[PDB]
Amino acid sequence: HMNEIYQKAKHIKLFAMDVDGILSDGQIIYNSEGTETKAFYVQDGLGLQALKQSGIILAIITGRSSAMVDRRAKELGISHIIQGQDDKLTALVGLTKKLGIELSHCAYIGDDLPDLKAVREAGFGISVPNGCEQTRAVSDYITTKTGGNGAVREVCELILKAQNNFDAFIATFQ
Amino acid sequence: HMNEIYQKAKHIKLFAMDVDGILSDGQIIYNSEGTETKAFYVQDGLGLQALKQSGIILAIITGRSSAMVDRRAKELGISHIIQGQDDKLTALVGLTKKLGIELSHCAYIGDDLPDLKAVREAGFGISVPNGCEQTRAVSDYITTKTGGNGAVREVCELILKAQNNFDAFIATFQ
Amino acid sequence: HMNEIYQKAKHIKLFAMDVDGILSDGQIIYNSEGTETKAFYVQDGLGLQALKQSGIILAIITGRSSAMVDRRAKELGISHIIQGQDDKLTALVGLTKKLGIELSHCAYIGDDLPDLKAVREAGFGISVPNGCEQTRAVSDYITTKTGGNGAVREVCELILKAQNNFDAFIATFQ
Amino acid sequence: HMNEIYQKAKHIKLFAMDVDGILSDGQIIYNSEGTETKAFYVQDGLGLQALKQSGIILAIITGRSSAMVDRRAKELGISHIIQGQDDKLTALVGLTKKLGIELSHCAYIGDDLPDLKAVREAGFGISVPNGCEQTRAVSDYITTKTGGNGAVREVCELILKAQNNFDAFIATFQ
Ligand SMILES: O=C(O)[C@@]1(O)C[C@@H](O)[C@@H](O)[C@@H]([C@H](O)CO)O1
Ligand SMILES: O=C(O)[C@@]1(O)C[C@@H](O)[C@@H](O)[C@@H]([C@H](O)CO)O1
Ligand SMILES: O=C(O)[C@@]1(O)C[C@@H](O)[C@@H](O)[C@@H]([C@H](O)CO)O1
Ligand SMILES: O=C(O)[C@@]1(O)C[C@@H](O)[C@@H](O)[C@@H]([C@H](O)CO)O1
Ligand SMILES: [Mg+2]
Ligand SMILES: [Mg+2]
Ligand SMILES: [Mg+2]
Ligand SMILES: [Mg+2]
Ligand SMILES: [Mg+2]
Ligand SMILES: [Mg+2]
Numbered sequence: 097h098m099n100e101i102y103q104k105a106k107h108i109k110l111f112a113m114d115v116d117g118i119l120s121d122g123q124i125i126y127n128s129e130g131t132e133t134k135a136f137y138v139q140d141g142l143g144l145q146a147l148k149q150s151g152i153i154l155a156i157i158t159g160r161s162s163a164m165v166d167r168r169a170k171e172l173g174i175s176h177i178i179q180g181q182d183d184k185l186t187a188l189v190g191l192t193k194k195l196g197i198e199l200s201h202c203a204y205i206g207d208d209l210p211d212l213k214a215v216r217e218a219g220f221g222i223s224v225p226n227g228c229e230q231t232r233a234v235s236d237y238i239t240t241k242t243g244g245n246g247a248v249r250e251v252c253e254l255i256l257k258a259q260n261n262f263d264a265f266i267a268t269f270q
Numbered sequence: 271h272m273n274e275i276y277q278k279a280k281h282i283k284l285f286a287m288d289v290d291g292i293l294s295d296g297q298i299i300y301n302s303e304g305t306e307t308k309a310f311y312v313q314d315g316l317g318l319q320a321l322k323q324s325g326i327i328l329a330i331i332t333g334r335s336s337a338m339v340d341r342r343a344k345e346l347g348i349s350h351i352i353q354g355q356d357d358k359l360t361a362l363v364g365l366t367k368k369l370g371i372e373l374s375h376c377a378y379i380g381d382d383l384p385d386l387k388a389v390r391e392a393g394f395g396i397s398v399p400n401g402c403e404q405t406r407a408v409s410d411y412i413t414t415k416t417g418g419n420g421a422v423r424e425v426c427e428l429i430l431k432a433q434n435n436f437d438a439f440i441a442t443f444q
Numbered sequence: 445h446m447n448e449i450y451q452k453a454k455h456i457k458l459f460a461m462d463v464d465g466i467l468s469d470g471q472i473i474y475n476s477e478g479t480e481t482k483a484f485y486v487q488d489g490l491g492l493q494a495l496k497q498s499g500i501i502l503a504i505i506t507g508r509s510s511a512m513v514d515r516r517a518k519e520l521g522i523s524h525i526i527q528g529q530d531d532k533l534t535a536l537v538g539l540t541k542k543l544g545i546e547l548s549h550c551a552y553i554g555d556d557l558p559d560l561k562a563v564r565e566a567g568f569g570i571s572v573p574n575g576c577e578q579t580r581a582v583s584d585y586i587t588t589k590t591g592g593n594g595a596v597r598e599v600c601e602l603i604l605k606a607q608n609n610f611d612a613f614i615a616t617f618q
Numbered sequence: 619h620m621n622e623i624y625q626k627a628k629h630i631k632l633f634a635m636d637v638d639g640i641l642s643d644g645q646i647i648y649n650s651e652g653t654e655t656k657a658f659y660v661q662d663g664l665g666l667q668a669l670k671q672s673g674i675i676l677a678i679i680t681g682r683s684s685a686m687v688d689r690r691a692k693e694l695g696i697s698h699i700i701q702g703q704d705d706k707l708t709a710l711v712g713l714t715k716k717l718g719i720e721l722s723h724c725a726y727i728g729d730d731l732p733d734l735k736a737v738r739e740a741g742f743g744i745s746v747p748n749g750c751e752q753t754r755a756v757s758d759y760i761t762t763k764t765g766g767n768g769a770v771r772e773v774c775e776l777i778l779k780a781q782n783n784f785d786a787f788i789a790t791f792q
């Protein structure tokens with residue numbers, strides 16, 4: 097039952113995300129001119145702005161590093177962009193310190209092994225259906241939609257509903 | 271039963287479309303050289319020309335903005351291209367005024383929250399299986415095929431059949 | 445039962461293909477620098493070389509036109525490349541005349557309305573699961589695998605088996 | 619039962635991979651500027667580093683040839699990169715000789731006909747669900763996940779478990 101999850105999302109002040117496998121579907125794409133490509137999902141962007149609008153801080157913590165991530169983050173107002181960092185919990189804890197925020201007030205979503213401890217230790221830990229078993233085992237919630245296909249949108253809506261901000265947001269479009 | 275839907279599509283003079291999640295599958299794609307990519311579906315193009323051929327005006331109303339949209343629109347003869355606009359109903363109403371057309375004569379298709387009011391208020395409102403629930407709740411029809419996979423083709427065929435123009439079009443290929 | 449289909453593929457001398465929706469999955473892809481992209485399937489290439497090796501002539505007949513098609517055709521030895529042509533039967537008949545070949549000796553595969561007559565009139569006509577109903581209605585065979593996912597590979601294997609050339613080809617890899 | 623497979627992976631010293639259809643999902647992608655694209659999977663990379671970390675040598679043997687393969691191989695420490703080579707067994711045997719290693723100590727994964735003999739003859743032979751039947755017929759194991767979607771990750775985990783290295787690796791993330 098969902099109230100158990102709303103209980104966890106209730107006091108989130110910060111939402112941090114892994115990129116590959118969460119914000120994208122995990123494809124790493126190269127071309128013959130040395131150029132790299134990453135694909136994001138349009139409904140995730142709108143869900144992230146909703147969350148962000150309700151006064152939640154958005155962050156990226158990713159093991160890889162690219163201009164694509166920076167660009168996607170900039171247009172959605174994901175305001176703390178940590179790249180080239182696979183020690184996710186350490187990075188999260190570091191953010192917690194510079195914002196004056198507790199881990200219990202952090203939500204984190206990841207698909208693989210570097211994310212497991214951040215997923216486990218955050219107030220609200222999320223993984224995805226194609227997440228590795230070990231990270232899923234340790235999460236508070238597993239999305240229905242998959243990474244780069246509205247897993248993020250889904251969690252945004254969930255946090256909004258827990259904080260009584262979803263229905264009002266919806267209403268602005270009706 | 272389908273006649274209920276044909277009753278609604280019967281008097282459409284204008285078909286307006288959201289892009290992301292409707293004409294594409296919702297992927298937003300960036301590369302390391304700062305270049306953006308969007309993917310469309312080939313069967314949608316042919317369905318749009320069929321509609322267009324039968325004397326329906328084609329329009330795009332999209333929250334984002336790109337040369338890809340302009341190019342795709344130009345080759346199919348989507349003749350009114352409104353980009354960087356998320357207030358879809360306002361944009362639709364504006365078109366209705368410059369063409370001398372009523373909303374009841376507009377069909378509109380969208381996948382997410384900015385489209386809900388245009389979907390609700392148009393004579394024929396359409397969403398897609400991966401559309402947000404709120405927009406689907408308010409639509410006259412939900413396509414079987416998904417966005418960027420022939421949702422548009424499907425609605426083109428539907429409007430054509432309602433206007434007794436489909437079978438004749440087909441016949442030109444037989 | 446399959447022998448009915450082998451009876452039709454038995455005397456094929458030429459295999460002609462539509463591109464979009466057959467050799468690709470139907471995605472039409474543009475980027476912000478004005479560049480177009482198309483995706484093909486690796487197993488189709490090998491199946492086409494097998495067919496080609498057994499002495500069947502390979503041709504493309506496509507409504508659109510691009511350097512991608514030319515390049516893909518060149519590496520597989522698809523030797524007649526007709527682009528910017530939607531009148532597929534006329535184009536096929538034209539090929540039949542310059543090679544001294546009958547239509548009954550042509551196999552053709554297509555997904556949409558411009559292909560229906562070529563599919564109907566060729567000795568062996570093929571469509572795909574996501575083909576429009578009208579073209580599927582008129583085909584001798586509908587592949588199990590979808591376009592850009594081994595529909596072509598599948599038909600190559602089928603023609604090879606009808607001509608007693610498949611098992612031998614396989615054997616060269618064992 | 620899985621122990622039968624662990625018995626085969628038990629003594630692997632080298633893991634060799636086909637690229638197209640294994641490391642990618644088989645898409646061959648061209649653009650209008652003459653540029654080629656290939657997509658890899660993020661979870662495969664991490665599984666390959668795990669394997670590699672446990673002291674297994676990683677190799678690529680692919681029929682095609684591109685800078686994308688070289689780049690992907692370089693970042694994961696796939697250390698022997700054989701491209702433009704479809705005679706996979708010969709290439710594998712050649713590697714076996716320059717490293718002083720037996721075939722029984724080689725694991726190989728491939729999706730199509732050029733890989734069948736390497737798959738058959740290696741100590742541990744793997745194919746994928748969308749592999750051609752002939753190669754699947756001759757393999758010791760068929761992955762559950764498909765190519766470019768974690769088939770490789772899956773086999774990495776399997777070899778690790780057979781060599782009692784998986785649980786320990788996992789533990790470093792807990
Ligand atoms: O993914 C996006 O960029 C996003 O979802 C953000 C929204 O604010 C909005 O601009 C939306 C468009 O309506 C989609 O066309 O795109
Ligand atoms: O998507 C297209 O551009 C379209 O469907 C439009 C049609 O008019 C026709 O040109 C078609 C081609 O037959 C597809 O190869 O492409
Ligand atoms: O799609 C290809 O280019 C093809 O299937 C053609 C084959 O001849 C062969 O070169 C094959 C490679 O073995 C795939 O890596 O690619
Ligand atoms: O595919 C990758 O490059 C890989 O899986 C390799 C890992 O070592 C790690 O860097 C991982 C990132 O954590 C994914 O963001 O990427
Ligand atoms: Mg990840
Ligand atoms: Mg691409
Ligand atoms: Mg793609
Ligand atoms: Mg949209
Ligand atoms: Mg086609
Ligand atoms: Mg691209």
Ligand SMILES: [Mg+2]
Binds near residue numbers: 486636639728729730
């Ligand atoms: Mg292969």
